[PDB]
Amino acid sequence: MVILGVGYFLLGLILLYYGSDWFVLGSERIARHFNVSNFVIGATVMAIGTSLPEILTSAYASYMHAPGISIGNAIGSCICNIGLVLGLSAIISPIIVDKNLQKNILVYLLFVIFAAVIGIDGFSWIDGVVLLILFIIYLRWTVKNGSAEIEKNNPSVVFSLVLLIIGLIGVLVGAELFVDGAKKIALALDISDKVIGFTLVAFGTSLPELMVSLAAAKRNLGGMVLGNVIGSNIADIGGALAVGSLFMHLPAENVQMAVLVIMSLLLYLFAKYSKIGRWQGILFLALYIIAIASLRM
Ligand SMILES: CCCCCCCC/C=C\CCCCCCCC(=O)OC[C@H](O)CO
Numbered sequence: 062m063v064i065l066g067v068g069y070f071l072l073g074l075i076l077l078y079y080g081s082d083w084f085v086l087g088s089e090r091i092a093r094h095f096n097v098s099n100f101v102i103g104a105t106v107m108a109i110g111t112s113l114p115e116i117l118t119s120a121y122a123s124y125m126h127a128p129g130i131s132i133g134n135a136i137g138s139c140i141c142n143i144g145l146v147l148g149l150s151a152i153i154s155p156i157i158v159d160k161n162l163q164k165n166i167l168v169y170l171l172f173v174i175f176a177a178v179i180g181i182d183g184f185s186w187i188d189g190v191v192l193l194i195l196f197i198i199y200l201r202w203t204v205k206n207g208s209a210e211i212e213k214n215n216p217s218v219v220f221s222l223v224l225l226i227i228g229l230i231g232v233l234v235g236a237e238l239f240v241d242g243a244k245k246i247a248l249a250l251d252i253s254d255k256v257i258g259f260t261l262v263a264f265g266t267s268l269p270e271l272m273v274s275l276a277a278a279k280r281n282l283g284g285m286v287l288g289n290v291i292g293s294n295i296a297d298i299g300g301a302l303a304v305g306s307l308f309m310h311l312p313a314e315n316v317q318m319a320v321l322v323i324m325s326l327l328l329y330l331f332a333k334y335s336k337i338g339r340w341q342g343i344l345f346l347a348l349y350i351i352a353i354a355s356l357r358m
Pocket residue numbers: 171174175178179180182185187188191
């Protein structure tokens with residue numbers, strides 16, 4: 062049957078749509094509770110939660126002797142977060158970046174370049190261990206700098222945590238349904254293609270970031286969007302790629318890493334010397350479009 066594919070697909074969108082808004086709302090509240098910025102909650106809790114698909118996908122693929130899918134998924138997500146996710150969000154809600162957030166973005170940049178350089182001959186399991194350690198350090202460093210918490214069964218907090226978790230479950234399940242529904246529609250229309258079907262789940266892992274960021278964008282939560290983008294990329298590299306490399310050596314993806322380094326560099330330069338708004342967003346989307354037009358499938 063195919064309506065099951067249609068049912069799923071539509072339901073996936075509904076869970077994604079409402080799930081994303083609840084995730085954003087709950088995350089914004091949690092940040093106020095812990096006295097940290099929206100960037101910080103976006104870069105830690107939101108980034109890790111929405112990167113769970115990438116982490117499972119890369120670990121699974123490398124385990125199943127498909128390390129090309131594992132690194133392809135990780136870095137492709139990174140390119141998607143800056144090009145598509147941040148591109149759309151910048152246009153919706155232009156961001157002027159604070160001096161301290163610029164420091165966080167510069168560190169992100171350094172991290173990406175380091176990853177690109179040690180991955181020129183691919184990524185070994187020791188490359189993995191190192192990247193994962195830097196990931197852990199980035200998280201502690203980010204929270205520390207974004208913290209002002211100097212000081213308990215509060216209904217405000219509990220309600221905040223419930224919005225967040227149910228929202229997350231909503232976007233993660235919604236995303237799966239979207240992919241699963243699309244897969245079944247494709248199969249019973251007999252238009253299924255593996256080469257393209259890998260980019261259905263590849264894009265699939267990026268749907269949480271997309272919807273969550275757009276939801277944050279609609280509520281002018283610019284720092285949260287930026288936090289979620291920066292953190293998700295780091296989680297995709299220090300987490301998804303890294304764990305992949307633990308099961309098997311990952312072949313180099315130098316062209317894609319170069320594209321990521323160029324987009325990351327652009328993202329930093331705009332954050333430091335300008336803004337992340339309309340035309341910066343238009344630039345990110347144009348670059349993203351060119352990438353999905355010309356990069357190897
Ligand atoms: C502020 C500067 C930040 C850093 C800018 C990049 C600096 C390091 C470049 C190359 C060596 C890295 C050595 C340590 C990490 C790799 C350990 C390793 O196993 O290296 C072999 C390599 O992966 C091949 O197989």
